[PDB]
């Protein structure tokens, strides 16, 4: 392998897709950013570490820009009104095989699949009802 | 509507799919568990809260068990050998439009799409490199 | 989806049926109340909690009023002359599958079925003999 | 005449029906037990007492076992892997006529009737939602 | 019944009406919001509780956006310059029948009817004179 | 003008309508009471105050009595068996235009229109569900 490569973060069906590319590897933390100012960029970082004697942990973080009414290349303050932050932590016991790990990835793909409760709630600015 | 519906958490192509159904809404925490003894069930919970004056925060958790049968005191009990835990928090500014919110959902879907860096590392007990 | 809906508590053929409707779900205690004066209403509450490491416990309560009018100083109010209080607690180990729980439910329906010892004793102001 | 007789606790069509038979009536506590090993038997007890000046109170209890075999040192015994414990108390004022008691009984049968909220929650290892 | 449904909050005669739809039910508090960002949304919430031994209380809250000079989807600060808050508390004695309650609703409909003092004062940025 | 005029608080279709008339403006609190002994009258009060440098707050109260005749000391007195109290506060920013204010009035009128969720729950001694 060598998985540290560019990938499509937001798939808008070929036209206006957001591609994110490797931008930093300081300390083993892989970083990927879109082609924007760092204030308006889509950013992804990922690292693994053995959290304890029985677990390995993946720390994945994603920053997404508020796009509606955005001024490209502009200075938009406060920073907090213009950015969403996603923080994921995946704890996996050292006994998990590649197969066990593949199933965990499917559980994550299903949780966020289109039409399911969680992504529908988020996209509609809602909770569960 | 009522977005509090069942969904398939793990899609094993119509056969051995893991579907999860609504099971509790006590204390404002929506819960969904699979059809199993509570000792072996998959569990998904979601709650939203106005974390600050200008934010809303969704807390989502998924538990994927590794089921086993354990002999305790000479008797067999349905049990989970271990569990994998996903904990996610998503903070969204109150200024985010529904289309701004659909953007966050797609980003999360693209992040875990098969073939992309992150779900590839996880499924292979590997880090990003 | 919801099971927090109205239902017929007392079935009197299809007329004079007592229907209890959702009223409040504060702190994990679901409450249902019949219509008209809250003072003469039937009441049902239900909650579940993990009573211990291996047990989940339901606490169900029902109140059946003896509907009456109170006249004091010529001012009459709709009241309940008195009430019966049913308090039940059901402890179920976390090892119980859905099948096991369905059996527990049949055991409860069988206990109270018409003609059986217990519902006959109650219905006739009696004990066992 | 007697109401201290055997009855079907669990009706499974006409076969696999669990029948509970009188066993002991010491100190005002009537007891019923199913056949075979007392260790794997169902148990029902019932008593009535004048709880206070105006109230009579019934204390009914039911135990549903999880039938299993215990093997220790090669010696196997018929045991109950675990048990659910139903404990109910019904308080009825001495002013209740037979008609009033019959209504109380219908209220109890209605609460547990198939399809209603409570028996559905229990049968599915759930709470209210 | 099942009254938790979408309704027209602001009737502008079919064209440009504001519809508000169910968006949250955490803790028994029903919420309805319009299709906007949460900062610019019309929001309604409602809950009932027995406030004391003799009263039931409804807590209804409504948030209305300042529409003149509004930038749809924009970040408008301070939040307080752009929102009106309505807070209603209805205390009803447990003796109130459905009929008594219907009259209370009429008293509320009359108080706010078009052309009456209170709604005229509010709409004209005035007090009473 | 002078918006301090009488109006019909409860419209019972021209017959048994409850009209309320101006009765006091002492201390800047406009008051309106129905044609009854002060012990049995409906009462409506309204006051506006510049609650903050940038807000104005209207405080409105309505009292709906349940009239009765009570025998005190062997003598009959016109009395109110009980009273229902509505307390509303509406905070409006000083930046709100008259059309912004007409928007708040319509929202309040739509909220209580017959058939909508809230006035339906209230009139039925029910919560929202």
From Swiss-Prot, chains A, B, C, D, E, F:
Q: Which UniProt keywords apply?
A: Capsid protein, RNA-binding, T=3 icosahedral capsid protein, Translation regulation, Virion
Q: Where is this region: Viral RNA-binding?
A: 31-104
Q: Which GO terms describe its molecular function?
A: identical protein binding; RNA binding; structural molecule activity
What does the UniProt entry list as the effect of changing residue 76 to A?
No effect on the organization of the T=3 capsid, but with a loss of thermal stability. No effect on infectivity
Task: Cite a single GO BP annotation.
Answer: regulation of translation
The entry's localization annotation reads: Virion
The record's annotation in Gene3D superfamilies points to: MS2 Viral Coat Protein (3.30.380.10)
One GO cellular component this record assigns the protein to is: T=3 icosahedral viral capsid
Function text: Capsid protein self-assembles to form an icosahedral capsid with a T=3 symmetry, about 26 nm in diameter, and consisting of 89 capsid proteins dimers (178 capsid proteins). Involved in viral genome encapsidation through the interaction between a capsid protein dimer and the multiple packaging signals present in the RNA genome. The capsid also contains 1 copy of the A2 maturation protein. Acts as a translational repressor of viral replicase synthesis late in infection. This latter function is the result of capsid protein interaction with an RNA hairpin which contains the replicase ribosome-binding site.
Subunit note: Homodimer. The capsid proteins form dimers that assemble by group of 5. Twelve such pentamers are linked together with free dimers. The homodimers binds to the viral RNA via an operator hairpin, but also to many other RNA sequences in the viral genome; this interaction probably shifts the virus from the replicative to the assembly phase and ensures specific encapsidation of the viral genome.
Return the similarity comment: Belongs to the Leviviricetes capsid protein family.
Protein name per Swiss-Prot or TrEMBL = Capsid protein
- Identify the species of origin: Escherichia phage MS2 (Bacteriophage MS2)
């Amino acid at each position: 392998a060598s998985n540290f490569t560019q990938f499509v973060l937001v798939d808008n069906g070929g036209t206006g897709d957001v591609t994110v590319a490797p931008s930093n590897f300081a300390n083993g933390v892989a970083e990927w950013i879109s082609s924007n100012s760092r204030s308006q960029a889509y950013k992804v970082t990922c690292s693994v570490r053995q959290s304890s004697a029985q677990n390995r942990k993946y720390t994945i973080k994603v920053e997404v820009p508020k796009v509606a009414t955005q001024t490209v290349g502009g200075v938009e303050l406060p920073v907090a009104a213009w950015r969403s932050y996603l923080n994921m932590e995946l704890t996996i016991p050292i006994f998990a095989t590649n197969s066990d790990c593949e199933l965990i990835v499917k559980a994550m793909q299903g949780l966020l699949k289109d039409g399911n409760p969680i992504p529908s709630a988020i996209a509609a600015n809602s909770g569960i009802y």
